[PDB]
Amino acid sequence: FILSKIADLVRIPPDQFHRDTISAITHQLNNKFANKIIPNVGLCITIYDLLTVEEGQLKPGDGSSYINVTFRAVVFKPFLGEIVTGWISKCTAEGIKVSLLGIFDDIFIPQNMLFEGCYYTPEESAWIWPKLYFDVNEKIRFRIEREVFVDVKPKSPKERELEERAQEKPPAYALLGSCQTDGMGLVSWWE
Amino acid sequence: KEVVVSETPKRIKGLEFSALSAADIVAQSEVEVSTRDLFDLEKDRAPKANGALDPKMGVSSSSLECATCHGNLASCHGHFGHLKLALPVFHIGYFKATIQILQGICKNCSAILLSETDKRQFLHELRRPGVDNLRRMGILKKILDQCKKQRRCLHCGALNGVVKKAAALKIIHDTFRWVGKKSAPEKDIWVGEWKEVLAHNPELERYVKRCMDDLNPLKTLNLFKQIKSADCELLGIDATVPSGRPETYIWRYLPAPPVCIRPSVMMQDSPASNEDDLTVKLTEIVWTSSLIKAGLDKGISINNMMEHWDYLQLTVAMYINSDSVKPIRGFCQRLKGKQGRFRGNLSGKRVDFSGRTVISPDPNLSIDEVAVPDRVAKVLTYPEKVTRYNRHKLQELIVNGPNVHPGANYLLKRNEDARRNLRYGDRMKLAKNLQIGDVVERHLEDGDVVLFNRQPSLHRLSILSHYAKIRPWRTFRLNECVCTPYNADFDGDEMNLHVPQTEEARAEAINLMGVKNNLLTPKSGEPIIAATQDFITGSYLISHKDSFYDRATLTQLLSMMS
Amino acid sequence: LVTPEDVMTISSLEQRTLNPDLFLYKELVKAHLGERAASVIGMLVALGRLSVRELVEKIDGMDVDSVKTTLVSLTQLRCVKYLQETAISGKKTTYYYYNEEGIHILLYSGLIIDEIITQMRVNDEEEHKQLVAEIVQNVISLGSLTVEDYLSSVTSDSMKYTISSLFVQLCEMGYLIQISKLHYTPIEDLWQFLYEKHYKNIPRNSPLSDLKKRSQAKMNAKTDFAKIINKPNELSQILTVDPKTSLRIVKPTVSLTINLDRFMKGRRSKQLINLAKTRVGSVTAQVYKIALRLTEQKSPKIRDPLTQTGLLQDLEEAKSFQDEAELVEEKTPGLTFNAIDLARHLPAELDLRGSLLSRKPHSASLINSHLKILASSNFPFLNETKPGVYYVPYSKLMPVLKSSVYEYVIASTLGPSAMRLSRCIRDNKLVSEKIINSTALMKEKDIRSTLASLIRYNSVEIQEVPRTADRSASRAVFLFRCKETHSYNFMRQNLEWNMANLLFKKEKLKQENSTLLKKANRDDVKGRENELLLPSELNQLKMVNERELNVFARLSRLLSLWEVFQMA
Amino acid sequence: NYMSNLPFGLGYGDVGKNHITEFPSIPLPINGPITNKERSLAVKYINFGKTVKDGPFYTGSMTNDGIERYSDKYLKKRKIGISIDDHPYNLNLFPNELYNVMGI
Amino acid sequence: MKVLEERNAFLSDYEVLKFLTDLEKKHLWDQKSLAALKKSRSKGKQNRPYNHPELQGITRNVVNYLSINKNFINEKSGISKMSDESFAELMTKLNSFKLFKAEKLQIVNQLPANMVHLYSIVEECDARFDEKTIEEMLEIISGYA
Amino acid sequence: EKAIPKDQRATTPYMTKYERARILGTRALQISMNAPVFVDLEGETDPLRIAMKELAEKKIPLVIRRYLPDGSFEDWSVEELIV
Amino acid sequence: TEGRSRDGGLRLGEMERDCVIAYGASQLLLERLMISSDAFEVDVCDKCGLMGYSGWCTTCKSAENIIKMTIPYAAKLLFQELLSMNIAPRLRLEDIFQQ
Amino acid sequence: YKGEVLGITRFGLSKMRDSVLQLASFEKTTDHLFDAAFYMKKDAVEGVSECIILGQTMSIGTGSFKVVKGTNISEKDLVPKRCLFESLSNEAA
Numbered sequence A: 001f002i003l004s005k006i007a008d009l010v011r012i013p014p015d016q017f018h019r020d021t022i023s024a025i026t027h028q029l030n031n032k033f034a035n036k037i038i039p040n041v042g043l044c045i046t047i048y049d050l051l052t053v054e055e056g057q058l059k060p061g062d063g064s065s066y067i068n069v070t071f072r073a074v075v076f077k078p079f080l081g082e083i084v085t086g087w088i089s090k091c092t093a094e095g096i097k098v099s100l101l102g103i104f105d106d107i108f109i110p111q112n113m114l115f116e117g118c119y120y121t122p123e124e125s126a127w128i129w130p131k132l133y134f135d136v137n138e139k140i141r142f143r144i145e146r147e148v149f150v151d152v153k154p155k156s157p158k159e160r161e162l163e164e165r166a167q168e169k170p171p172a173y174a175l176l177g178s179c180q181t182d183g184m185g186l187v188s189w190w191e
Numbered sequence B: 001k002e003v004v005v006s007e008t009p010k011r012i013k014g015l016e017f018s019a020l021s022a023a024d025i026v027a028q029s030e031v032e033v034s035t036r037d038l039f040d041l042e043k044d045r046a047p048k049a050n051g052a053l054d055p056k057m058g059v060s061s062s063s064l065e066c067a068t069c070h071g072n073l074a075s076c077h078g079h080f081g082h083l084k085l086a087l088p089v090f091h092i093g094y095f096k097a098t099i100q101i102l103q104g105i106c107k108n109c110s111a112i113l114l115s116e117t118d119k120r121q122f123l124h125e126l127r128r129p130g131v132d133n134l135r136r137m138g139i140l141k142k143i144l145d146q147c148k149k150q151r152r153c154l155h156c157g158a159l160n161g162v163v164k165k166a167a168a169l170k171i172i173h174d175t176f177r178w179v180g181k182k183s184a185p186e187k188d189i190w191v192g193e194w195k196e197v198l199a200h201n202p203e204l205e206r207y208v209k210r211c212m213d214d215l216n217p218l219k220t221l222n223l224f225k226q227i228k229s230a231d232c233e234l235l236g237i238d239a240t241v242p243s244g245r246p247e248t249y250i251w252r253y254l255p256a257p258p259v260c261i262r263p264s265v266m267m268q269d270s271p272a273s274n275e276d277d278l279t280v281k282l283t284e285i286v287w288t289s290s291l292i293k294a295g296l297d298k299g300i301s302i303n304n305m306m307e308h309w310d311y312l313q314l315t316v317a318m319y320i321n322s323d324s325v326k327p328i329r330g331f332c333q334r335l336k337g338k339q340g341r342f343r344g345n346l347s348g349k350r351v352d353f354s355g356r357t358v359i360s361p362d363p364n365l366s367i368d369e370v371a372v373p374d375r376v377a378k379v380l381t382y383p384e385k386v387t388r389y390n391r392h393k394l395q396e397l398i399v400n401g402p403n404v405h406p407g408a409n410y411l412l413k414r415n416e417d418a419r420r421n422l423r424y425g426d427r428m429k430l431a432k433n434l435q436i437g438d439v440v441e442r443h444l445e446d447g448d449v450v451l452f453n454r455q456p457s458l459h460r461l462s463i464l465s466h467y468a469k470i471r472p473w474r475t476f477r478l479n480e481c482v483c484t485p486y487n488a489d490f491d492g493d494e495m496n497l498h499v500p501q502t503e504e505a506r507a508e509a510i511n512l513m514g515v516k517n518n519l520l521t522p523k524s525g526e527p528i529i530a531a532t533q534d535f536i537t538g539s540y541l542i543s544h545k546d547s548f549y550d551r552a553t554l555t556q557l558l559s560m561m562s
Numbered sequence C: 001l002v003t004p005e006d007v008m009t010i011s012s013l014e015q016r017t018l019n020p021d022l023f024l025y026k027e028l029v030k031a032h033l034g035e036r037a038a039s040v041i042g043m044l045v046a047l048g049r050l051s052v053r054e055l056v057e058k059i060d061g062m063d064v065d066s067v068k069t070t071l072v073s074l075t076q077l078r079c080v081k082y083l084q085e086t087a088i089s090g091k092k093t094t095y096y097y098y099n100e101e102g103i104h105i106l107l108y109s110g111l112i113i114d115e116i117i118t119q120m121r122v123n124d125e126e127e128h129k130q131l132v133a134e135i136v137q138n139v140i141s142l143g144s145l146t147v148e149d150y151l152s153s154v155t156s157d158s159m160k161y162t163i164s165s166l167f168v169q170l171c172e173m174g175y176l177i178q179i180s181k182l183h184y185t186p187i188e189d190l191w192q193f194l195y196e197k198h199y200k201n202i203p204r205n206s207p208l209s210d211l212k213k214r215s216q217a218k219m220n221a222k223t224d225f226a227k228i229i230n231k232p233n234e235l236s237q238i239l240t241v242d243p244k245t246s247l248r249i250v251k252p253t254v255s256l257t258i259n260l261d262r263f264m265k266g267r268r269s270k271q272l273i274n275l276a277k278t279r280v281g282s283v284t285a286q287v288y289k290i291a292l293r294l295t296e297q298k299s300p301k302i303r304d305p306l307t308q309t310g311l312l313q314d315l316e317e318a319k320s321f322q323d324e325a326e327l328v329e330e331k332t333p334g335l336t337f338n339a340i341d342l343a344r345h346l347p348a349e350l351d352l353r354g355s356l357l358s359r360k361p362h363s364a365s366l367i368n369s370h371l372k373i374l375a376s377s378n379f380p381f382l383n384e385t386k387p388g389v390y391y392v393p394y395s396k397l398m399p400v401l402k403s404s405v406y407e408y409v410i411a412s413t414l415g416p417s418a419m420r421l422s423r424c425i426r427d428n429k430l431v432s433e434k435i436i437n438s439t440a441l442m443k444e445k446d447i448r449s450t451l452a453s454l455i456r457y458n459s460v461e462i463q464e465v466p467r468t469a470d471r472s473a474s475r476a477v478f479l480f481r482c483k484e485t486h487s488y489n490f491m492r493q494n495l496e497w498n499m500a501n502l503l504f505k506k507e508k509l510k511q512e513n514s515t516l517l518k519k520a521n522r523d524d525v526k527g528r529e530n531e532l533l534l535p536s537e538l539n540q541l542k543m544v545n546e547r548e549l550n551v552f553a554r555l556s557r558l559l560s561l562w563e564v565f566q567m568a
Numbered sequence D: 001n002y003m004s005n006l007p008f009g010l011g012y013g014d015v016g017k018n019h020i021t022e023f024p025s026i027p028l029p030i031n032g033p034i035t036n037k038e039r040s041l042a043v044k045y046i047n048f049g050k051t052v053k054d055g056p057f058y059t060g061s062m063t064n065d066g067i068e069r070y071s072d073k074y075l076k077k078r079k080i081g082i083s084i085d086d087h088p089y090n091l092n093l094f095p096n097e098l099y100n101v102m103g104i
Numbered sequence E: 001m002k003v004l005e006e007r008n009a010f011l012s013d014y015e016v017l018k019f020l021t022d023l024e025k026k027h028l029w030d031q032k033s034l035a036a037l038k039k040s041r042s043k044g045k046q047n048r049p050y051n052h053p054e055l056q057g058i059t060r061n062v063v064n065y066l067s068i069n070k071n072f073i074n075e076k077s078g079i080s081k082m083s084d085e086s087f088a089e090l091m092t093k094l095n096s097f098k099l100f101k102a103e104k105l106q107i108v109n110q111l112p113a114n115m116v117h118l119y120s121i122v123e124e125c126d127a128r129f130d131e132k133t134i135e136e137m138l139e140i141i142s143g144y145a
Numbered sequence F: 001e002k003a004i005p006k007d008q009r010a011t012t013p014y015m016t017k018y019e020r021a022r023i024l025g026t027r028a029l030q031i032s033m034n035a036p037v038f039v040d041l042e043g044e045t046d047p048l049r050i051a052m053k054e055l056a057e058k059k060i061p062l063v064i065r066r067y068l069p070d071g072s073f074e075d076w077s078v079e080e081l082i083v
Numbered sequence G: 001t002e003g004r005s006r007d008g009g010l011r012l013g014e015m016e017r018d019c020v021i022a023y024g025a026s027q028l029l030l031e032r033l034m035i036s037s038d039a040f041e042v043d044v045c046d047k048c049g050l051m052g053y054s055g056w057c058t059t060c061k062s063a064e065n066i067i068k069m070t071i072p073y074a075a076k077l078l079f080q081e082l083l084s085m086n087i088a089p090r091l092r093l094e095d096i097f098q099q
Numbered sequence H: 001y002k003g004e005v006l007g008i009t010r011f012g013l014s015k016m017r018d019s020v021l022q023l024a025s026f027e028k029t030t031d032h033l034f035d036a037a038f039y040m041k042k043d044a045v046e047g048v049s050e051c052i053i054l055g056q057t058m059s060i061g062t063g064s065f066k067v068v069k070g071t072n073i074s075e076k077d078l079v080p081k082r083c084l085f086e087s088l089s090n091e092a093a
């Protein structure tokens, strides 16, 4: 959790001219930044406050107020030294699908930077160890090392048409964990 | 997921005019056109791949799919196709440009006819912060004339002379225009070469006359492709960006237009669809290109290919600009003319929500009013948005409907994209469900701002803004006081009425072009809306010194006055 | 049917519209120095003459310091020429050219150090090979490598003594020439600076007219420009000084930069040797390898003495420069050698005993026989002025060499009948539609098929014969022409564009393989590549490494083709 | 109607397809077999360019956290690059505008 | 749209909790939203033509993740009951414990009462200090517990 | 890109016909978009006439940004622009 | 359309355009000549001034720089005709806002 | 005002306008367009003719100024608020 100063142009419809300007601005900004991921900036939750509010200028055809506003918004940004308590929700023999209560879940962990001895099986046996393991939907503890922003998306209209008729990298922000040190992986290994 | 998406309104700051290089033509094109056939009797006249009417370039009717964007005629923006031309050809619009380019350079070593330190003073002058079109043409013409004066090139002086065209559409260069009483190694080589010819031709003695350095498009493309980027600026072709290379100005790839650019009409004369001029010309160009390509893998007569290749140099000429020997309508015919493209569609066009009928007088009308027929008031609508202030009024109008004049023709819901015709649908429910964002296209009403215009529109007072007044008859009635700015005289005159459709346009009309705000002509400031003939006569007869009125007559006069 | 999306990605259509002169050098600087340097050099190529502020306002890099650093890097790399032209009524600002010959150093680098390695008389010592390879690699990678830097670098004196020993030899071959102001200024601007002083040195009211003052000014300008170019083109003044009780030493203060003129003379000699090997059997072809090897060192200028690029050639009486070039060619006594001179440099491997047969041990008489067959051969390899001593001419060998190499490249590209028609249109001047049949006597079908296939290039010219006053080529028969100049022009452009395609391919492979290349080019990884690498990744590394080796082999094999069209 | 312009040497089957080969194909013979000398040319080529890029002559470049990990404390520096001004050069061959970047 | 700078001021995981709490009390109340309203706003687009989708979920998920008991072991929420003075009374220890690291946001909300926890939070800890200053830290960060 | 400070201003203090027409158009468009009005309607439904009434009462909350040709601009509220 | 039997519209010629200009009514010009005659929502790429379709530039194949704006369909037709010849009328854009 | 008497003839209109759209709308459409494309002209959209052709607002009349709605936001509700962890961490060094 870190703030971030973002400058954006915000359009306030004339319907919202009755409410006060700061509340209208924060409403529109929340609509633009509710659960959105800012490209290669991370995931936003809401907006903290506003810093500079320029006068709202009108284009010759709209009638709405277009306001240049500067705001700080809360961003989930682990860099390298953060331990988190996730809630796993899916298990697959490529690294367990660690997840949250629903803030954001698409993050993955690879086994190689997890404990070496932990290995997957086709028979769906949890873990094999040289003495203890865990099952799905339980507290986990891990780290963060590097961040990969998926921001490449060339999608042609006819390719999208064929995909729609037939009906991947879903996120622009993911997390990478590691359990190289004793303890992390569970908050109740001893005592 | 749900990454942030940003939209910022933008305007067109400027235009960059250039040429589409061969790379860009294929970059924009979504198909190549190669087959000379638009339809086959085998496919039952259904447009199939690589034809001139390939649907991937768009559709000609609103019941077809593009296969590029999958939209009908009302949605497809049109898509491009490209032609690969074996033995590329000259460019008619760039013919003068190529003539001037070949003047500035020598055709021997592909080097500019400018000293590497002489015109650099004027090159430096070109970077003046304040440079106009007159300045650009001035230094460019000076450079061209200096190159014309410069006979011998600094890399290879072969006596570059004139680059005059053929007496055709060909380029012929006088290699030895300025020779006399002089012997050179080039002259000796030429003399030996034509002594070799004279000894094997008993009749070429007369025909060796003329036969100077002819410049074909293929040679020019090869010579242009040898021009370095360094001396492109002195040719006026900025080579900073790709496609600034002069060789891109030679016709090599033909960007065949989208189908929407050249629509194919439905059911003219014969039951079969009728094609159009640009389609036919590109079909023929495809045919001749295929023929010339086939001649490369078979070796047709070089004289015969010159016939077909020269026809390619022609068939593109009136494909772009029909000038040479004539009803063939090319591209430059679409843009030129009173009914062309610019003067016919860009600056001046036909407009919606307008009417025209005979004008009749009306003294009981205010000078800033026009009497509008209820018959045209029931078609000419204003798209009023429903607010907290007019919702009951718009509900009453919707209940009235499209057949009773204080009514409405269409309703556009806030969350919908198509307007609901009010002829059908039990308008009672729509009136009840009217929201605060819907649009009611209600009939023209009293006090509506309308534009009123009589042609010819000589001065700006030929079009004024009035307040509509709905009346039973079929004429546009106006106060005779406001006939003078229009130059109208109720002798059968017809005037055009325009209904502005937006709030800003309506306010601008009634505030700047209103009759009350335009009682004086801006040419001199003298009043122009005033009494006409019978009003002047009646005023004179009233104010005449013999006119005496008792109390009853005076009060009746005042009551008629008001 | 190919899709427009499918082409322009695997078809390289968008690279066909780049001018090869800009594309090649841009790609070279991209590969070697960096993208800012390449952008600067590309702006310099597109805009031949511009200042630093022009770079600031044209390149997106709107920074004085960054442009300054990139430009100083390019100037150190000998890839940029500069000048300071003074505006008297105000402030002077320096302008910037781009060095053409400088970029060949990094380009020809492999061939450069290869000819360095294989050219030394003493090459059988492995350590000496490594020393000379490393020293010439350092000089071409650093630019102006200097003794006061390298001697201070080397940590032991005895290996410092050899460094100075190699320098004097390497300068005498001309491989290390003294850099100066003559190596950063344009030739036309030098000619103008030496033409405007002499137009200003003439006092008024002299009886001579404008023509005579112009003639005297131009001859004085020619003579002093020739002196100023002759002084640093070949000199040993840096090697002249000798301290007491010490060996001959070069000036340590001066900066030693690798030359290209004598190396490219050696490359031309090497290509002529390969021509001889292809032309004549190896018995007396072996003697031709060292025959040109004793003249290549002091060989004259290949194409232009730089008196033909700085000014317009000539309008009236234009043969004077060819006349003076051949005059120097015949007036130079050092270049000419006798058979006694050659016997002192012939290797012991060659015997020259069975190389002759008069009728159907290093003897100067037999060497004279090879020299006579060379002089009287169909290609003018040598010309005889006096009995026993001849010389290598260039006033009549360059055109035939260019015609042969060009025409044979057409031979390698097109078919046999195309070769035949090319030969016919070359030898028989101004051929026609009946003259081709009269002088060819083969099948007209293939004749005109290959003819049409050959019209595409700049090989042949098409003429128009107007039967009437107005010119229509479909009304009357037309004849052909030669115009060999455009044909030679094409071989430049096509070859440089194909080269630039090679460098684009290799740099794009690098751009898609950068992570693996970075992992490879690590000190501890280097030499250890079969142990700490995953199977598929290491196998892919071998494939991409061999692919780069193949592209380099193709590059080198192509590198024997463009210089022979880079002459006059 | 432009459909009857056919030379006697030209038939009907060939015309109509057109569309050209996507890239012109003439196999150049400069891709012959490799030898030891050619492999050595490739090796010396890859050593070159790599030398100038590992040197100070790059001028090409256009985890950055404002907070320093304790691992980054007392950790090895990447490489102390020799600056362009750091390497000595000859003033007589560089313009006056380029002197400021250099260390006098 | 342009982001001025990525790394703005850090957030202690009590400032975020109180921010989301004052947000919930200012509007978008959870106990109020769980009730029904037949009339609604009557304007046409929600109460005073507005609605809050995609934001109530995110302001619930974060606040619930904070309100869950801190995972020192497998009674309170753990973040709820520290007042402002409760965090202003910690200076003489928080800013006296020299760490040469801005990693203080780790131990204010997670991993108390475990030496391995702190040894992971600050790297190379035992080499840096393993004598006596490894337990009073746990006691103080467990003081609220 | 520099606003002239309010204390001194060179442009005219009177409202031009174009300024009045554009202000009325903008205000009427806003009213037609259900913006609140600061005038007593007395049963008027036309947004244009409501805007004229607000202009007569000088209760239009818009300012006029008059750009000088040199690029600067001075801001004039509808209230301070005298008719 | 341009006929009474075809339910045609009334042409606002260059003369009426001149009169409306002389009035200084920019919004009325826009409404009569663009909104009420031929309004087309085109896709214009910000990188190349070339019109796209369905939010796709189909020349850089990126869809990243595509901007949405309304222009006369006559202007769109003119640009597509100019691209048919060897003219590339590249549109440069700028924000109305940010001052 | 250009220093020479320039007419209202087609040749005169090519004085300094550089507006290829306006020139082509006036007269000689094709030659002007092709010369502009060949010269790589970069004409901006500033005239009323070009603005009408492109559907833009002209800088004349009601388009010669800008309407701006004052936000009426005070300077007490714009400063950052509730920030102390950064101060604590800075004082920790």
Ligand SMILES: [Mg+2]
Binding pocket: B488, B489, B490, B491, B492, B493
């Ligand atoms: Mg009449």
Ligand SMILES: [Zn+2]
Binding pocket: B056, B057, B058, B059, B066, B067, B068, B069, B070, B071, B076, B077, B078, B079
């Ligand atoms: Zn389509």
Ligand SMILES: [Zn+2]
Binding pocket: B106, B108, B109, B110, B111, B153, B154, B155, B156, B157, B158
């Ligand atoms: Zn020349």
Ligand SMILES: [Zn+2]
Binding pocket: G045, G046, G047, G048, G057, G059, G060, G061, G065
């Ligand atoms: Zn694009």
